[PDB]
Amino acid sequence: DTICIGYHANNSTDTVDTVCEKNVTVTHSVNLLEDSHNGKLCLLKGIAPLQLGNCSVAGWILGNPECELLISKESWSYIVETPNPENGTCYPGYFADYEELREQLSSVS
Amino acid sequence: QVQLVQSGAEVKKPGSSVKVSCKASGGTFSSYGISWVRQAPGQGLEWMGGIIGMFGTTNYAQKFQGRVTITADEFTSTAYMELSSLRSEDTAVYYCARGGSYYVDYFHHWGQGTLVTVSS
Amino acid sequence: QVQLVQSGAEVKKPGSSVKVSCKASGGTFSSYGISWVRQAPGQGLEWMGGIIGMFGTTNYAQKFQGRVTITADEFTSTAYMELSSLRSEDTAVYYCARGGSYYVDYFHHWGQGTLVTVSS
Amino acid sequence: QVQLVQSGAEVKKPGSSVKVSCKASGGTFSSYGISWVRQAPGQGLEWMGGIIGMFGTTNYAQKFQGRVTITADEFTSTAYMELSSLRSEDTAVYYCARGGSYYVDYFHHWGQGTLVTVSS
Amino acid sequence: EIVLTQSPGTLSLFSGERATLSCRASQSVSSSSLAWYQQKHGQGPRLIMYGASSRATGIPDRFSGSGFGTDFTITISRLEPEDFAVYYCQQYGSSSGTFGQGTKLEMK
Amino acid sequence: EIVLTQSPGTLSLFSGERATLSCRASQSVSSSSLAWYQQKHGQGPRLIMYGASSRATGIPDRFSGSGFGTDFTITISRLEPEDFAVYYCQQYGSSSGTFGQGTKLEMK
Amino acid sequence: ECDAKCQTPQGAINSSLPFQNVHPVTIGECPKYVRSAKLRMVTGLRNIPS
Amino acid sequence: IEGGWTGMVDGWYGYHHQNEQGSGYAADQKSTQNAINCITNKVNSVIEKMNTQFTAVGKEFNKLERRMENLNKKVDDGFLDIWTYNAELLVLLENERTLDFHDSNVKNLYEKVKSQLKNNAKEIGNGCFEFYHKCNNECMESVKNGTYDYPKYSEES
Amino acid sequence: IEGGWTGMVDGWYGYHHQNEQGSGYAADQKSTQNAINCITNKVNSVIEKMNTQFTAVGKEFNKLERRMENLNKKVDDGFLDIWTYNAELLVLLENERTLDFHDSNVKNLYEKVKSQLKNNAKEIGNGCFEFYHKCNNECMESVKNGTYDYPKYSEES
Amino acid sequence: IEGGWTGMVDGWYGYHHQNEQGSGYAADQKSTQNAINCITNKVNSVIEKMNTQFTAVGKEFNKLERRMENLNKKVDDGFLDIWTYNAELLVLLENERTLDFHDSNVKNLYEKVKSQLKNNAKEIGNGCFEFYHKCNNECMESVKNGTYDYPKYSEES
Ligand SMILES: *[C@@H]1O[C@H](CO)[C@@H](O[C@@H]2O[C@H](CO)[C@@H](O[C@@H]3O[C@H](CO)[C@@H](O)[C@H](O)[C@@H]3O)[C@H](O)[C@H]2NC(C)=O)[C@H](O)[C@H]1NC(C)=O
Ligand SMILES: *[C@@H]1O[C@H](CO)[C@@H](O[C@@H]2O[C@H](CO)[C@@H](O[C@@H]3O[C@H](CO)[C@@H](O)[C@H](O)[C@@H]3O)[C@H](O)[C@H]2NC(C)=O)[C@H](O)[C@H]1NC(C)=O
Ligand SMILES: *[C@@H]1O[C@H](CO)[C@@H](O[C@@H]2O[C@H](CO)[C@@H](O[C@@H]3O[C@H](CO)[C@@H](O)[C@H](O)[C@@H]3O)[C@H](O)[C@H]2NC(C)=O)[C@H](O)[C@H]1NC(C)=O
Ligand SMILES: *[C@@H]1O[C@H](CO)[C@@H](O)[C@H](O)[C@H]1NC(C)=O
Ligand SMILES: *[C@@H]1O[C@H](CO)[C@@H](O)[C@H](O)[C@H]1NC(C)=O
Ligand SMILES: *[C@@H]1O[C@H](CO)[C@@H](O)[C@H](O)[C@H]1NC(C)=O
Ligand SMILES: *[C@@H]1O[C@H](CO)[C@@H](O)[C@H](O)[C@H]1NC(C)=O
Ligand SMILES: *[C@@H]1O[C@H](CO)[C@@H](O)[C@H](O)[C@H]1NC(C)=O
């Protein structure tokens, strides 16, 4: 007769790093980092957001003549802005505490 | 203490595929084995198949052997179903079970179950 | 290097209880054993009892066996006293000692001592 | 992949000392052995000496035994030279080599080399 | 997985007296390849026994079972109206499982 | 370090035929105290063999070598114009090293 | 239209893993942002088949 | 122990036998199941400690508040550097322990067999034993599980 | 080693004997004292590294400085999250080493006895040895301490 | 193993012999070289994780912005305290593993010799073996390297 001792070794190809070894294959592993995104902004938690579009916060609050559609909507989860809005304060001027208004307006629902 | 919860009851047209998701309350990372069982109306239970812990080894009865596929997302402590080619005889209740160990040994935890019927 | 410091001299009425606190300079977490000894005026020393490291096992001489209780807060490296039922014969000097090991073996570190007298 | 880089070509007056620095691309902490070799114009190579890993043990051929000193800053993966008492016969090319192990065994990595000449 | 024979399911008895349930395995199986589940109409099963000799947690001393190879059988020390139900026997050799038809336990 | 004898360096041969190179050690040395390097005029050497029996990485099957003690010698399966060069043999007993004079390999 | 738990300027994460690296800014319950390109935990043994 | 197995499944640690009763791999459920508990508790602990419920919406400042932007930028960058270092260090450190953890279990199991498998079986070094007594499944499973009958067999002794 | 003791005191590691001269537990002062040093130095190191001398008095800002409050709030919350994670990780990590540290000491002591207690004593596995030679206190304490007289006894050999 | 060596060089782990063919220390290149790889990879990992590319130029604020200075001061002090704790903890923790790492290697090598050096050699405990058979350099290096000829010698057996 004969008896032997061993351990499992499947054909997986999971690579992990440790203190002083690199690229060591392991039978099983769990991934904790996620790097996949849908790449598509959309509604969150059942409430649609406010697509400001071509009007910045300054244009939205002051009621710019354009982007009139923003007036109708009054409930949202978060505010999304175009990187370079082109319909901000229509009449030239200085908007006092404009940055500080965003923080006040950021938390509103 | 833990609780087993399954998806809601569903009805599917004949010749389609039905998917039922089993999840455990506080479903953090888990390795307990899972299985499934059918309780036909007015008849006794009959085993279907189950998973084995981290190893992810699946075994199914020879009755179908090609129609049911089970995969478990251990990170979320969830077990799925991919039953296909439903028929009239398949109208029964499906239950989610755990054995308390990575193997597929006896079961002592059950969910609320799900009633699935097939008709037009 | 370490230094043993005791509380100041105290005088108590007969039939009362006197407490003396022993502390070590830089009294971080310590496990060295502690004990006590009496030096009556013009007479030799006599052992009282001590603690044993983390285990906190206390042994006292049979002379009293009920009158002296010692507990050490190892975190602060302090040893306390709860001597009770003082009498005229008890007027002497009390010293704090360490053995250098968790056991209650010989002592080689001593404090400045404390003189306690009993009278009305 | 790694690359061995040496200092630029230099010319020294007779009777002076010449220093050549050998460095490895991406020169993080390393322990590989280093050595040196001379390739006289139109003649074969001849070993000089080398270092041994962390232990920093140096061995040199008996031809000079006092004229060449090698020290390696392992943290920067650099090897230096302190050859002294140059002469006309010493005009040749010096190469930096590695053995792939802490010992001074055979070499399989080489730099671009350096041509050093002696004249007034 | 292996076929299991079953005796007739007509077992009529009153409460408060010894009761027995019959479940026969076709072939000899490991003693640690047995269990017992209790199911009442309209509700899912519940554990009774595991290993053929160990009583599950939260089970009183009114349940007992024994058998090896093919003579598997169980008995009830004292039947109670709540404990009355349909009982299923499980067999699991290795990486498999099976159940029985289901006894037709009844009250006269 | 130890003196190494060398045969005459005049070895003229054409490509595409078996070739041999001679390098004799004065005294017996460990089989793992040998190597071979290839150098062409104007460029630094390059590894050929290590241990007298193991071929370095990125070396075709056109190189072979054998010998123990003092009869160290190598042969070329099929000479090629690019593979033609001057070859140096290394000896390293322990914490030391040495090279040869260099064969005067030539094309007729 | 979506039902993602977290929203990000580059999109939605849609999963509940502890870590993410798509974008530092997030809205709602979101995995923490980690600059590491990749990280994993070993659950089995070293694979050295013979 | 010198070299893993591929035919074996359903267990990280298992035995082997070549008796005439039948040759086939087997798994140690008790040993493997215990190891899984530590892994499940270990991975859960990492997730629980790494909380993620907080507000990360960015702010903006005008041109005259350059000091705010640099100070605000440093705070954001500082925490990301800290968390990145903490996340890697904990994961890298835990992986090494897990790899060593398995070695102790398999080695501990091997020693446990040695104690239960007395000198009657000759050890050949490469994680195997040779029996001086012929044994069937009944005795083979005795060594595999926690019951053995050493005094019964005394052949070649 | 399989199962702790309750009658024993004054030592984490100790022996036992049943000779006619007297049965009673004993402690290994040299082994126990060495272990205490590491624990005392280990706990001290944690306290010393965790400095606590700093100012933590909170500030307040008016209504128009909402940016200050949110930025100031994040700084306070950020550090508390970091320190909470650091405090637990260091304590949890150190505890595992301490538990394993004791196992090595007791196991190392057991092996040390084996080397000094040669084959003359039969090992029964459960952390015990059976002597082939009758021994009194003089010999019993020889095994307990660092001096033994193996060549004197050769009974049943 | 009980006590280091000073004459030996060119290796952290080495053997010794006293045969008439010649007495002299030797090093195990395979064992030492493997250990160096972990050390080199271990020290490199610490440096890589500890990034240092960032702006640290200090700022100044007027008298009426005392809140900025206190808040800015806390941010600078907070990070320095965190990094100081992280730097020491990682270095202190890694040192302990390295010291234990060497012990396993040397002890593992000692056990490896025991397996290859069967009972023919008597173990005297203090990290040494006594051979029952006279051996020359050819056999001595057999034990040192990975090839041995146990069946050839059976003297006193
Ligand atoms: C460990 O494994 C061994 C071997 O598998 C187990 O031995 C088993 O012991 C039981 C006794 O409770 C045997 O049952 C009896 O077998 C005799 C055989 O003639 C039969 O006449 C009796 O009616 C009864 O069934 C069993 O046969 C035996 N195993 C085998 C394969 O023969 C042992 O129980 C296991 N221990 C543990 C703790 O798992
Ligand atoms: C370890 O323990 C053993 C046993 O307790 C110690 O043996 C002791 O050895 C000393 C010798 O220095 C003995 O002292 C001599 O005893 C003889 C007995 O006839 C007496 O005639 C002499 O005048 C002298 O006192 C001592 O008796 C002996 N112990 C016992 C119990 O007999 C040993 O010394 C210990 N070693 C260490 C390093 O702790
Ligand atoms: C481990 O070390 C031993 C001892 O140093 C090595 O033994 C060596 O084995 C080779 C066989 O390939 C011997 O070479 C032959 O020696 C005979 C002696 O008469 C000679 O006639 C042959 O022509 C051939 O050269 C070698 O002599 C022998 N070593 C000694 C010192 O005699 C063994 O090879 C080493 N193994 C490894 C894997 O390192
Ligand atoms: C190899 O890996 C594949 C997937 O990568 C898996 O399906 C298969 O079962 C493994 N084993 C064999 C023998 O192919
Ligand atoms: C080896 O590790 C490096 C580390 O960055 C990685 O880039 C590379 O892809 C790995 N290669 C293999 C074959 O695992
Ligand atoms: C918003 O701006 C984009 C930029 O070209 C333009 O194409 C689009 O018509 C604008 N939409 C509205 C509603 O003004
Ligand atoms: C709004 O933005 C569009 C984009 O080009 C521009 O053509 C238009 O003049 C803007 N109108 C106002 C009122 O800002
Ligand atoms: C992720 O997207 C899929 C596809 O629509 C959806 O079924 C799933 O519910 C989403 N996950 C969450 C957490 O909402």
mmCIF file of C-alpha atoms in Angstrom, chain I:
data_model
loop_
_atom_site.group_PDB
_atom_site.id
_atom_site.type_symbol
_atom_site.label_atom_id
_atom_site.label_comp_id
_atom_site.label_asym_id
_atom_site.label_seq_id
_atom_site.Cartn_x
_atom_site.Cartn_y
_atom_site.Cartn_z
ATOM 1 C CA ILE I 1 -0.094 20.967 24.736
ATOM 2 C CA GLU I 2 -3.552 19.683 23.762
ATOM 3 C CA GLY I 3 -5.609 21.508 26.373
ATOM 4 C CA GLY I 4 -4.636 24.158 28.899
ATOM 5 C CA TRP I 5 -4.267 23.899 32.659
ATOM 6 C CA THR I 6 -6.093 25.624 35.507
ATOM 7 C CA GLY I 7 -4.318 24.404 38.645
ATOM 8 C CA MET I 8 -0.995 25.791 37.440
ATOM 9 C CA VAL I 9 -0.161 29.400 38.322
ATOM 10 C CA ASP I 10 2.803 31.792 38.330
ATOM 11 C CA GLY I 11 3.717 30.952 34.737
ATOM 12 C CA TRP I 12 2.361 30.722 31.202
ATOM 13 C CA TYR I 13 4.446 27.605 30.458
ATOM 14 C CA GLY I 14 4.980 24.778 32.925
ATOM 15 C CA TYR I 15 5.644 21.079 33.382
ATOM 16 C CA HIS I 16 4.026 18.244 35.317
ATOM 17 C CA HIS I 17 5.170 15.051 37.008
ATOM 18 C CA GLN I 18 3.670 12.079 38.842
ATOM 19 C CA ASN I 19 6.704 10.536 40.536
ATOM 20 C CA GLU I 20 6.273 9.029 43.992
ATOM 21 C CA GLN I 21 8.386 11.876 45.402
ATOM 22 C CA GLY I 22 5.401 14.177 44.826
ATOM 23 C CA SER I 23 2.909 15.269 42.164
ATOM 24 C CA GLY I 24 2.497 18.967 41.442
ATOM 25 C CA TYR I 25 2.551 21.605 38.724
ATOM 26 C CA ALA I 26 5.579 23.813 38.131
ATOM 27 C CA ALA I 27 6.418 26.849 36.015
ATOM 28 C CA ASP I 28 9.347 27.604 33.706
ATOM 29 C CA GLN I 29 10.492 30.996 34.971
ATOM 30 C CA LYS I 30 13.157 31.416 32.287
ATOM 31 C CA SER I 31 10.696 30.769 29.455
ATOM 32 C CA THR I 32 7.820 32.791 30.916
ATOM 33 C CA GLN I 33 10.003 35.764 31.854
ATOM 34 C CA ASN I 34 11.452 35.998 28.342
ATOM 35 C CA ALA I 35 7.957 36.091 26.840
ATOM 36 C CA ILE I 36 6.908 38.905 29.182
ATOM 37 C CA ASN I 37 9.763 41.099 27.943
ATOM 38 C CA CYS I 38 8.463 41.021 24.367
ATOM 39 C CA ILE I 39 4.905 41.763 25.510
ATOM 40 C CA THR I 40 6.035 44.688 27.665
ATOM 41 C CA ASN I 41 8.185 46.080 24.853
ATOM 42 C CA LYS I 42 5.439 45.424 22.296
ATOM 43 C CA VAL I 43 2.688 47.232 24.210
ATOM 44 C CA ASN I 44 5.037 50.111 25.047
ATOM 45 C CA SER I 45 5.930 50.588 21.378
ATOM 46 C CA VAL I 46 2.269 51.016 20.415
ATOM 47 C CA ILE I 47 1.730 53.715 23.041
ATOM 48 C CA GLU I 48 4.915 55.605 22.167
ATOM 49 C CA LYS I 49 4.172 55.749 18.435
ATOM 50 C CA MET I 50 0.599 56.959 19.017
ATOM 51 C CA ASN I 51 1.354 60.520 20.069
ATOM 52 C CA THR I 52 -1.511 62.580 21.471
ATOM 53 C CA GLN I 53 -0.087 66.074 22.177
ATOM 54 C CA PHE I 54 -1.949 68.442 19.849
ATOM 55 C CA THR I 55 -4.714 71.042 19.780
ATOM 56 C CA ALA I 56 -8.204 69.797 18.892
ATOM 57 C CA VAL I 57 -10.418 72.775 19.803
ATOM 58 C CA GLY I 58 -13.075 73.267 17.152
ATOM 59 C CA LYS I 59 -13.703 76.423 15.145
ATOM 60 C CA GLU I 60 -16.864 78.041 13.800
ATOM 61 C CA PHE I 61 -17.601 80.030 10.649
ATOM 62 C CA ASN I 62 -20.327 82.462 9.647
ATOM 63 C CA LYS I 63 -23.045 81.784 7.084
ATOM 64 C CA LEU I 64 -21.161 83.163 4.065
ATOM 65 C CA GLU I 65 -18.120 80.929 4.744
ATOM 66 C CA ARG I 66 -19.862 77.624 4.021
ATOM 67 C CA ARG I 67 -16.812 76.567 1.999
ATOM 68 C CA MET I 68 -14.597 76.921 5.076
ATOM 69 C CA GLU I 69 -16.926 74.784 7.193
ATOM 70 C CA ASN I 70 -17.158 71.995 4.615
ATOM 71 C CA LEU I 71 -13.398 72.072 4.031
ATOM 72 C CA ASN I 72 -12.675 72.254 7.764
ATOM 73 C CA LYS I 73 -15.191 69.479 8.439
ATOM 74 C CA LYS I 74 -13.522 67.212 5.878
ATOM 75 C CA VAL I 75 -10.097 67.702 7.471
ATOM 76 C CA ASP I 76 -11.420 66.691 10.892
ATOM 77 C CA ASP I 77 -13.419 63.757 9.526
ATOM 78 C CA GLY I 78 -10.555 62.617 7.306
ATOM 79 C CA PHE I 79 -8.045 62.314 10.138
ATOM 80 C CA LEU I 80 -10.513 60.552 12.441
ATOM 81 C CA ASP I 81 -11.192 57.951 9.752
ATOM 82 C CA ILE I 82 -7.453 57.472 9.201
ATOM 83 C CA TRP I 83 -6.581 57.178 12.893
ATOM 84 C CA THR I 84 -9.495 54.815 13.516
ATOM 85 C CA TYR I 85 -8.266 52.550 10.715
ATOM 86 C CA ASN I 86 -4.647 52.788 11.869
ATOM 87 C CA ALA I 87 -5.522 52.094 15.511
ATOM 88 C CA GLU I 88 -7.531 48.961 14.716
ATOM 89 C CA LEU I 89 -5.146 47.596 12.084
ATOM 90 C CA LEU I 90 -2.105 47.845 14.354
ATOM 91 C CA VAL I 91 -3.937 46.344 17.338
ATOM 92 C CA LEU I 92 -5.552 43.569 15.297
ATOM 93 C CA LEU I 93 -2.298 42.757 13.497
ATOM 94 C CA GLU I 94 -0.238 42.674 16.700
ATOM 95 C CA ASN I 95 -2.708 40.373 18.471
ATOM 96 C CA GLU I 96 -2.309 37.655 15.840
ATOM 97 C CA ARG I 97 1.478 37.705 16.200
ATOM 98 C CA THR I 98 1.237 37.490 19.992
ATOM 99 C CA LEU I 99 -1.051 34.455 19.812
ATOM 100 C CA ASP I 100 1.336 32.765 17.381
ATOM 101 C CA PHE I 101 4.296 33.966 19.456
ATOM 102 C CA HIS I 102 3.207 31.927 22.479
ATOM 103 C CA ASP I 103 2.705 28.804 20.364
ATOM 104 C CA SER I 104 6.321 28.929 19.191
ATOM 105 C CA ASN I 105 7.591 29.364 22.756
ATOM 106 C CA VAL I 106 5.637 26.426 24.186
ATOM 107 C CA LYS I 107 6.349 24.299 21.113
ATOM 108 C CA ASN I 108 9.999 25.360 21.190
ATOM 109 C CA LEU I 109 10.159 24.419 24.871
ATOM 110 C CA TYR I 110 8.611 21.036 24.067
ATOM 111 C CA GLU I 111 11.260 20.362 21.419
ATOM 112 C CA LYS I 112 13.975 21.512 23.827
ATOM 113 C CA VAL I 113 12.789 18.891 26.317
ATOM 114 C CA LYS I 114 12.846 16.268 23.558
ATOM 115 C CA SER I 115 16.494 17.031 22.781
ATOM 116 C CA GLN I 116 17.478 16.927 26.456
ATOM 117 C CA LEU I 117 15.032 14.063 27.128
ATOM 118 C CA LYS I 118 16.448 11.458 24.772
ATOM 119 C CA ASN I 119 14.744 8.266 23.578
ATOM 120 C CA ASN I 120 14.951 6.903 27.142
ATOM 121 C CA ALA I 121 11.529 8.525 27.658
ATOM 122 C CA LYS I 122 8.676 7.249 25.493
ATOM 123 C CA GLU I 123 6.558 9.954 23.860
ATOM 124 C CA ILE I 124 2.808 9.293 23.999
ATOM 125 C CA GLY I 125 1.878 12.221 21.739
ATOM 126 C CA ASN I 126 -0.458 14.216 23.995
ATOM 127 C CA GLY I 127 2.296 16.516 25.212
ATOM 128 C CA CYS I 128 3.737 13.955 27.620
ATOM 129 C CA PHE I 129 6.621 11.522 28.026
ATOM 130 C CA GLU I 130 6.923 8.157 29.774
ATOM 131 C CA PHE I 131 10.264 7.378 31.412
ATOM 132 C CA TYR I 132 11.878 3.956 31.164
ATOM 133 C CA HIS I 133 13.917 4.778 34.296
ATOM 134 C CA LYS I 134 12.652 5.617 37.768
ATOM 135 C CA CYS I 135 13.604 9.197 38.650
ATOM 136 C CA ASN I 136 13.381 11.227 41.857
ATOM 137 C CA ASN I 137 13.203 14.997 42.373
ATOM 138 C CA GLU I 138 16.938 15.349 41.712
ATOM 139 C CA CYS I 139 16.547 13.917 38.213
ATOM 140 C CA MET I 140 13.114 15.465 37.636
ATOM 141 C CA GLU I 141 14.430 18.993 38.161
ATOM 142 C CA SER I 142 17.361 18.116 35.886
ATOM 143 C CA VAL I 143 14.942 17.849 32.962
ATOM 144 C CA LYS I 144 13.085 20.966 34.109
ATOM 145 C CA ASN I 145 16.266 23.060 34.230
ATOM 146 C CA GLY I 146 19.207 23.166 31.832
ATOM 147 C CA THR I 147 21.290 20.276 33.219
ATOM 148 C CA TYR I 148 20.695 16.584 32.512
ATOM 149 C CA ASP I 149 22.636 13.365 33.134
ATOM 150 C CA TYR I 150 21.619 11.172 30.189
ATOM 151 C CA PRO I 151 24.673 8.839 30.213
ATOM 152 C CA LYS I 152 23.931 7.811 33.812
ATOM 153 C CA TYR I 153 20.700 6.001 32.873
ATOM 154 C CA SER I 154 20.613 3.355 30.137
ATOM 155 C CA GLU I 155 17.872 1.026 31.384
ATOM 156 C CA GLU I 156 16.034 -1.025 28.750
ATOM 157 C CA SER I 157 18.813 -0.269 26.262
#
